[PDB]
Design a protein around this ligand. Structure first.
Ligand SMILES: */C=C/C(=O)N1CC[C@H](n2nc(C#Cc3cc(OC)cc(OC)c3)c3c(N)ncnc32)C1
Length: 298
């Protein structure tokens, strides 16, 4: 049922599955070893992650996994985007092989690096994580701005940018992931007559929610929310406000208060990202240039 792609195909006999890696954010993912996947070291057994259907998989799960694979194929390689390494598409279950990120998603990464006593704080391995500096959070912000700048230039809309959908490698490299709702658009806005509301409310631009249209400027809105998450060390956006009441509040013009780890300059960048009129928000290219300069002064 799956056409062969010889340039991406990876032999099953070379891939050994290990332990499950969590589930919830990126579907069913497992650790694995793949001999000769890494062309740089084509004899070495490299650690990877494999996404695969569960026993309780639906028909849509299959098509979604295929679509994420092809989306990954067409997006291309970038330092701040999770890389497609290969795939197993014939004679057996569908395996999509991706870059391994040892430190998990950004949310949990930040939450483990929160001060003892704060909500959600926890010591991984029962050992305390070295504290997030200001430079670290801005570097995290910059890397993600770079990733989205690349995505935007590949004429692609993520539509679910959050810290839960960002992966973090051993060397603390940010890697945008979860292309479940990602689409390849043109210059005009993404609109469909048949509405589905599969987008998380608290990360959605108003035009996404009210007009059911999506642009690169909507992903900017979500980046503003991602900034807020970063600088609150994985805090829940619109704290104390249920999703149900946020429909009303966005129309009234509600925005989130300034994180205390954040500078005025950066919160302004946040507030610009949260402009009601999409073309009044900065572009990712602009966001990169600013974050460059700020990071340089640290
Ligand atoms: C809610 C948390 C989780 O479910 N996990 C925490 C971190 C664990 N984990 N997931 C992945 C992954 C992935 C992945 C991303 C992606 O983006 C486009 C596509 C695919 O397949 C299409 C898979 C990882 C990785 N990659 N490394 C380490 N831990 C991971 C699970």
């Amino acid at each position: 049922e799956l056409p062969e792609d010889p340039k991406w195909e990876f032999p099953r006999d070379k891939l050994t599955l290990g332990k499950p890696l969590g589930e919830g954010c990126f579907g069913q993912v497992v650790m694995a070893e793949a001999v000769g996947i890494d062309k740089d070291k084509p004899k070495e057994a490299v650690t990877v992650a494999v996404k695969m259907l569960k026993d309780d998989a639906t028909e849509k799960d299959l098509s979604d996994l295929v679509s994420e694979m092809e989306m990954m194929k067409m997006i291309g390689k970038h330092k701040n985007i999770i890389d497609l390494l290969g795939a197993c598409t014939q004679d057996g279950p569908l395996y999509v092989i991706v870059e391994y990120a040892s430190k998990g998603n950004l949310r949990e990464y930040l939450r483990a690096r929160r001060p003892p006593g704060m909500e959600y704080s926890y010591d991984i391995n029962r050992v305390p994580e070295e504290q997030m500096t200001f430079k670290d959070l801005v570097s995290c912000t910059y890397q993600l701005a770079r990733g989205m700048e690349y995505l935007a230039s590949q004429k692609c809309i993520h539509r679910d940018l959050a810290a839960r959908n960002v992966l973090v490698t051993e060397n603390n490299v940010m890697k945008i992931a979860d292309f479940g709702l990602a689409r390849v658009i043109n210059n005009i806005d993404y609109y469909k007559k048949t509405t589905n509301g599969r987008l998380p409310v608290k990360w959605m631009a108003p035009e996404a929610l009210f007009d059911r249209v999506y642009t690169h400027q909507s992903d900017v809105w979500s980046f503003g929310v991602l900034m807020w998450e970063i600088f609150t060390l994985g805090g829940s956006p619109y704290p104390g406000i249920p999703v149900e009441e946020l429909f009303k509040l966005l129309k009234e013009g509600h925005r989130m208060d300034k994180p205390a780890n954040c500078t005025n300059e950066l919160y302004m960048m946040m507030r610009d990202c949260w402009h009601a009129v999409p073309s009044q928000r900065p572009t990712f290219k602009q966001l990169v240039e600013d974050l460059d300069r700020i990071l340089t002064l640290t």
